[PDB]
Design a protein around this nucleic acid. Structure first.
Lengths: 77, 191, 171, 234, 96, 69, 137, 197
RNA sequence: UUUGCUCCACACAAUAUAGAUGGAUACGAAUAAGGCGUCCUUGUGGCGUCGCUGAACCAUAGCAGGCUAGCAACGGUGCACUUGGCGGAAAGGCCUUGGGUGCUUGCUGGCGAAUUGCAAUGUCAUUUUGCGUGGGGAUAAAUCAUUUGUAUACGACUUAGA
RNA sequence: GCAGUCAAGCGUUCAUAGCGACAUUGCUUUUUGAUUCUUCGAUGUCGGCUCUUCCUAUCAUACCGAAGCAGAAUUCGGUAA
RNA sequence: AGAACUGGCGAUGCGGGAUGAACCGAACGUAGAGUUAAGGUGCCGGAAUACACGCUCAUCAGACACCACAAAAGGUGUUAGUUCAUCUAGACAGCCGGACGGUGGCCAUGGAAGUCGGAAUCCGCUAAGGAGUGUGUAACAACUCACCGGCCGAAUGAACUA
RNA sequence: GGCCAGCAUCAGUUUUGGUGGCAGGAUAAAUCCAUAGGAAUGUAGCUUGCCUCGGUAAGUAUUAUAGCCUGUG
């Protein structure tokens, strides 16, 4: 009966989202974030056991001069 | 025939100050302030007086003069809302399942929450429009009062309750349940 | 075209049984003499059985406005044959000259009742001497005391394809 | 007239518009009565029930009471001296002040003035007047008289009247087993209240005729004496 | 002449063209909607599909017919050693 | 939503010339069928009605004054 | 302290005594007083001090100017010219910056080559003066 | 007269602007149209959305990848309106179209360049008051174009920067106006006044 | 790689025009409304003024712009530097600090110009590549063949090998 | 369908010379759901297997409106491919 | 469909109608210049986004032929008209009031009082008020209109045509 | 003497401007002037009510401290 795109069932889903489901998502995420912090701490703890530049400037200037010299510019003529 | 000039008169009371620049109308008075954007109507205002304002259309058709009286009446409803204030009273009635209508703060906002409508386990949430006050009369059982400076907001939110409790797939000659506007009035009563 | 008003005066060709026949005059609005004289002959055909070959034109004379710079309320009387019968009409035309009023009415018939210059019969045009005698509100709306109206939303005709300012619809 | 216009709703009833000739007839009857009778009082009967008017009209036979448009009566008597009908009569058309009746008569002025001083009948407390009482509709099943005869003496108000009680009268009514019912007593008006329309429509609905009616008579024109005496019995 | 007996299409027209994927590592064409209130997390990961095996699961699905009953499930084992960060890329939001 | 097909306004040559044939046929049949006034009209909103009425009523004498010697 | 404020657009009005500017035709650039209103699009104008014959003209042919003078409805050319004189309409017009821009364009269009050279050198002199005035305070 | 004419798209009618620009391009003139998302069409919004969906029905039935291509961005809607006004299947038509650049928003370098308007295509001077009209950005968003919020954000930023620029320029023209008025009565100023300057 | 490659200072060959020849000269918004200036009580405020087109504004004089002498100001402007800040939509531009050297038609002088023979675009940009001209910086990969089988009709794909 | 009828209108000059929408009446197998359980020359070869798409004049599913629609079900209608 | 005539095509290009046996234009050697026809002048496309008077907004306008069909009508779209009617003895729209008396007329029946029905359908009193226009009641009650009247103040209604 | 051109004075065809002199007509109608009447979209004045402070409402009055219409010349 009621389709996937059904407004009624989607609205029941949306009411349900904000309850137990988003709670469980956010709590799960907090736990995984703490595990990541543990992981980085362990790794740093084993660690203690021991323009942009001239390249990009010439690159861009050449590219723009080639586009102006072959008449192939999106932005200028 | 194009009327050379057709006019309507918006009479401002003693306590009200209205500001109209580029067809954006601000109306300020004792009960607060209202603003409406009238930039879709090609209409011309004029302060003939501190107590009267003339709204006029030059060289207008039959459809264009139909919008003068609308504009005048909209500004008039603003003025009455900012002085008298609009007060819609709704009465909810039921046969077997008592409707439970409460006001709840869901997520920093304000909601009318209708429950048990014909025994529905569904909870019906009607957002409260800004500037509309939802009050529950105690002197009369099962009645909601909506009040605000804007007739548009109050009437729309009242109609939103009216429609959120529409009876579906039942004979509405026998199933009389719902939330009905009983009385449309003014907050004051009498001035 | 741009109209002129003529009088066209004619009569039947004289006979042994009748010298000096009656002279008949019509005031005729037309672009030029030739159209006006043909117009005369058509109407004289319809009014009574006078053939163009049986009569002549005794005169044709352009009629000008006595005061071609005084705005008058004109009451114009028209019959026509569009599009499915025949009709009477009466149009008020606030205007300066009879020929301009007639040209305005011909444009109005072409615009609304979709009728050509050959389908329109001007029966009588009269300067309403008294403003109380005007009957149409679209003309009676310009007769009011101390009349003023703006011309809102002025559109400025531009001789240039491009403009360097956003245009203004002021005064 | 150009389109999108309100459609005139007509029905198939018998009686027809009267027209100009009825006003002409009233005009001429007033004229002939002026020529015939002597005393012409102007009577103010602004809101008068027809049985009252017919009883007043039949509490004498040898006289005549004429009503109609106020403007046509002021016309018949005449607006001013330049258009009046009898010497010093325009002082009467200046005294036609609403629903006006003309009482042509030959009865002595004392008789008429005492009769119109002392005639009274009860009416409904018509709106826009001081309220002559205060009735509170009791709580419970509302009956036809709203308690003015006891509950066992009155019959319940028709259930079909409840939409009017709830919408046109603004009385908070319920239907409990087919009987109109208010949960709490409802007062309609207080003594001394300047009645609104809905108060006076509620009072008429319960048949509350606590108020009274009497004819407000202003000046009368004495025909032969050709003068008007400003009697005023409000 | 209309189709005599109506039958649904063989196949899916939204999985076309059925060509060889341009790379062995499938692209991620959409990442979960960023919520700045939460702490920083990675939205995906990389592993290698090792194979499949069989699981008995003590199913706690209330309202089901297998509620409080062991159910045998097939599962896929993805070998996932830790991945190591080596770079950042910043994306600007442009009208193209 | 799903806008349907819009009929073409591009007339065909065949249709157009067929319409010409139909219209000619209709003219000829109308002539064949055709082979088998109550208003002097002085308008009721013209302002000078009474003046022109009186003028032309004065001109009804000539149709009977002169004809006999 | 608290009054209603409504921004009224101050439209030029087509009124008896409004003076117009005929932008095209045989009367180009000449003033003319509106004498009577014919209809929404056409009026009767009169410009006797500038050489404009009394005529009925479309409102799209003329430009309303801010200047208005008292003038009875339907005034013949004699009283139009008299009231034009008495109200100093030409003076009020020529004082307006609109007439100054028009006169400036007519003066520039008549410059010969020598005067254009003189304009160049004078503008360079005023440039030296102004740029000295700048960078100074 | 300019080498490149950067036309502000806002408030212009699609067909009339397209015709003006097409005749400009065919005449050898280089045109850039910016702010293609505030460009206007006559008729209510639903009517033009319906006309676009009518266009959007068209597709080669046997292989939809070679049918009409329904480009959604307002620059491309304007470009389609313009390409129908040029014999684009020729070398002359192709050459003329390549004198045209159309953008949403105002990207560099044209944000620092003067923008013009075409009055004979401006909705204000053309379309009678009270008649409904369609803004092209709304239409494009409604039928698929998915960068309206981006362009709105960047246009708000560009307006902030340009407002700063205009404040500075108005301060400087206040200074220059004071200077020219202080020299407005000298002998050379009166001489220039005699010559209409 | 007779040092191939790249980035910096000159001399010319080849030059190239979907069409240079004073300057694409930057608010936003409204259009039945606004711009600008000023004031306060900083507003949908007051006052003034403006449009009615860019027919504007800036530039603009010199052998296609030479060589020189002064006056007056300390302004404008060019170039190569340098100071700081801003610009990520396609930023590749905008603004700013300081000195250095020119120019200055803001004003007044001195000399040259011819013969291109009465016109012939009468060539005045950069557009780049390059044989070279003398100073810097840089020191890889890909394919085939072999191999793999997460792929495969063949190409292709995915691996491995100093 | 035929034959009538009425007449909104039309013609008009005469509304009876004539046309003429809608509405309606006679004809069709017996008024008490029995029969009428009841067949009567297609000068025609198109039709199924697989498979795709389109139409909407919608059978279903979605949402609506009107009904003695209590509920359940149904009927009629709308948007909808 | 038959007759009689006259034109067009056959044998014939060219301009126009986007296209083309039947349409509009057009005296076919090779060219030059001018002017035109029919058709046009936003762009495609040579040529006015000319001037001017109106009308039209179409949730798939029209650009088109028309004593052509679907076509006779339907529409609280808009415009111009025609005829008739009402109107300072107060018009249209609103509220407010009266809306009566014989009488609950006769018959019917469980009831039927203007309003389930069948037939009468009159009189009085009137400014006006049906032996009742509809909602209503078991019947009544009440409300309502049609009809008058009070307040307001000046134009309005109806049928038709384009 | 070959190729390509510029200018001038002409001839033929033609296109587009500037300007002059006449003729006609209601011997243009008009505008303008003079005059005789007249009215309202009534000017001054006058009367009166209302007052927000000299303005305001309706009467009166035919040029007056504005004008207009018509006829004739």
């Amino acid at each position: 009966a009621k389709s996937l795109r059904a407004s009624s069932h989607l609205n029941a889903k949306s009411v349900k989202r904000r309850g137990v489901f988003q709670k469980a998502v956010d709590a799960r995420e907090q736990r995984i974030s703490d595990k990541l912090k543990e992981d980085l701490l362990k790794q740093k703890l084993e660690d203690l056991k021991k323009w942009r530049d001239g390249r990009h400037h010439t690159y861009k200037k050449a590219k723009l001069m080639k586009q102006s010299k072959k008449k192939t510019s999106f932005t200028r003529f | 025939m194009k009327y050379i000039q057709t006019e309507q008169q918006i009479e401002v009371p003693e306590g009200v100050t209205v500001s109209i620049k580029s067809r954006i109308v601000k109306v300020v008075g004792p009960r607060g302030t209202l603003t409406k954007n009238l930039k879709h109507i090609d209409v011309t205002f004029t302060k003939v007086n501190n107590q009267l304002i003339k709204v006029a259309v030059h060289n207008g058709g039959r459809k264009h003069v139909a919008a003068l009286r609308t504009v005048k009446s909209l500004v008039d409803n603003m003025i009455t809302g900012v002085t008298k204030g609009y007060k819609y009273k709704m009465r909810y009635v039921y046969a077997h399942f008592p409707i439970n209508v409460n006001i709840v703060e869901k997520d920093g906002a304000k909601f009318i929450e209708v429950r048990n409508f014909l025994g529905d386990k569904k909870i019906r949430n009607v957002p409260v429009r800004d500037g509309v006050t939802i009050e529950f009369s105690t002197n009369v059982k099962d009645e909601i009062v909506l009040s605000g400076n804007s007739v548009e907001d109050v009437s729309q939110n009242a109609a939103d309750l009216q429609q959120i409790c529409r009876v579906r797939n039942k004979d509405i000659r026998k199933f009389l349940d719902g939330i009905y506007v009983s009385h449309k009035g003014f907050i004051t009563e009498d001035l | 075209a741009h109209f002129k008003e003529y009088q066209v005066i004619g009569r039947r060709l004289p006979t042994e049984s009748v010298p000096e026949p009656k002279l008949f005059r019509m005031r005729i609005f037309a672009s030029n003499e030739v159209i006006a004289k043909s117009r005369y002959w058509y109407f004289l055909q319809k009014l009574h059985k006078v053939k163009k070959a049986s009569g002549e034109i005794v005169s044709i004379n352009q009629i000008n406005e006595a005061h071609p710079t005084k705005v008058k309320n004109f009451g114009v009387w028209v019959r026509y044959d569009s599009r499915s019968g025949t009709h009477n009409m009466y149009k008020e035309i606030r205007d300066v000259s009879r020929v301009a009023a007639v040209e305005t009415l011909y444009q109005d018939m072409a615009a609304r009742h979709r009728a050509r210059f050959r389908s329109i019969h001007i029966l009588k045009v009269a300067e309403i001497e008294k403003t109380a005698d005007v009957k149409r509100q679209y003309v009676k709306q310009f007769l009011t005391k101390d009349l003023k109206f703006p011309l809102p939303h002025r559109v400025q005709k531009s001789t240039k394809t491009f403009s360097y300012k956003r245009p203004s619809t002021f005064y | 007239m150009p389109r999108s216009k309100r459609s005139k709703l007509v029905t198939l009833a018998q009686t027809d518009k009267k027209g100009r000739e009825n006003k002409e007839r009233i005009f001429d009857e007033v004229r002939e009565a002026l020529d015939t009778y002597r005393y012409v009082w102007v009577l103010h009967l602004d809101d008068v029930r027809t049985p009252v008017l017919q009883e007043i009209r039949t509490s004498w036979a040898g006289s005549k009471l004429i009503m109609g448009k106020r403007k046509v009566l002021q016309k018949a008597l005449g607006e001013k001296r330049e258009e009046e009908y009898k010497e010093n009569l325009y002082q009467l058309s200046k005294l036609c002040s609403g629903v006006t009746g003309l009482l042509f008569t030959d009865e002595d002025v004392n008789t008429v003035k005492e009769y119109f001083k002392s005639y009274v009948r009860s009416d409904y407390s018509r709106p826009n007047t001081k309220a002559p009482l205060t009735f509170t509709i009791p709580e419970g099943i509302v009956y036809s008289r709203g308690g003015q005869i006891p509950a066992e003496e009155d019959v319940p108000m028709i259930h079909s009247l409840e939409p009017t009680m709830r919408n046109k009268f603004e009385i908070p009514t319920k239907i409990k087993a087919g009987k109109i019912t208010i949960d709490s007593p409802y007062l309609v008006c207080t003594e001394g209240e300047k009645l609104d329309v809905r108060q006076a429509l509620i009072l008429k609905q319960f048949g509350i005729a606590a108020s009274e009616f009497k004819v407000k008579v202003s000046a009368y024109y004495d025909n032969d004496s050709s003068t008007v005496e400003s009697t005023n019995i409000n | 002449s209309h189709r005599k007996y109506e039958a649904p299409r063989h196949g899916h027209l939204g999985f076309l063209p059925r060509k060889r994927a341009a790379s062995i590592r499938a692209r991620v064409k959409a990442f979960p909607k960023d919520d700045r209130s939460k702490p920083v997390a990675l939205t995906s990961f990389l592993g290698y599909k090792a194979g499949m095996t069989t699981i008995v699961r003590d199913l706690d699905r209330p309202g089901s017919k297998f509620h409080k009953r062991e159910v045998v499930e097939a599962v896929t084992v993805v070998d996932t050693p830790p991945v190591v960060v080596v770079g950042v890329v910043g994306y600007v939001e442009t009208p193209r | 939503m799903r806008v349907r097909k819009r009929q073409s306004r591009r007339t065909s040559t065949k249709l157009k010339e067929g319409i010409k044939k139909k219209a000619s046929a209709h003219r000829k049949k109308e002539k064949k069928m055709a082979k088998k006034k109550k208003d002097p009209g002085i308008p009721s909103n013209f302002p000078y009605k009474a003046k022109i009425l009186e003028e032309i009523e004065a001109k009804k004498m000539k149709d009977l004054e002169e004809r006999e010697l | 302290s608290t009054d209603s404020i409504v921004k009224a657009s101050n439209w030029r009005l087509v009124e008896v005594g409004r003076v117009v500017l005929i932008k095209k035709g045989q009367s180009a650039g000449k003033l003319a007083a509106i004498v009577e209103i014919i209809d929404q699009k056409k009026v009767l104008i009169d410009g006797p001090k500038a050489g404009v014959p009394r005529q009925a003209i479309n409102l799209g042919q003329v430009v309303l100017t801010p200047l208005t003078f008292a003038l009875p409805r339907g005034a013949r050319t004699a009283t139009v010219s008299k009231k034009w004189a008495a109200a100093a309409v030409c003076e009020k017009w020529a004082a307006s910056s609109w007439a100054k821009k028009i006169a400036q364009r007519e003066r520039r269009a008549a410059l010969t080559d020598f005067e254009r050279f003189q304009v160049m050198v004078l503008r360079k002199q005023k440039r030296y003066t102004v740029k000295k005035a700048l960078a100074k305070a | 007269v300019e080498p490149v004419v950067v036309i502000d798209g806002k408030g212009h009618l699609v067909g009339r602007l397209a015709s003006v620009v097409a005749k400009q391009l065919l005449n050898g003139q280089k045109i850039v149209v910016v702010r293609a998302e505030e460009l206007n069409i006559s008729g209510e919004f639903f009517r033009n959305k319906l006309k676009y969906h009518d266009f959007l029905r068209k597709a080669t039935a046997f292989n939809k990848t070679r049918g009409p291509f329904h480009f959604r961005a307002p620059s491309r809607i304007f470009y389609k309106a313009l390409r129908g006004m040029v014999s684009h299947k020729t070398a002359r038509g192709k050459a003329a179209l390549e004198r045209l650049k159309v953008f949403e928003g105002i990207p560099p370098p044209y944000d620092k360049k003067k923008r013009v308007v075409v009055p004979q295509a401006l909705r204000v001077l053309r379309l009678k008051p009270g008649r409904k009209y369609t803004t092209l950005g709304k239409l494009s968003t409604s039928v698929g174009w998915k960068y309206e919020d981006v362009v709105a954000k960047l246009e708000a930023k560009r307006k902030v920067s340009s407002a700063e620029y205009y404040a500075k320029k108005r301060a400087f023209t206040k200074k220059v106006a004071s200077a020219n008025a202080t020299a407005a009565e000298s002998d050379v100023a009166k001489q220039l006044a005699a010559l209409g300057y």
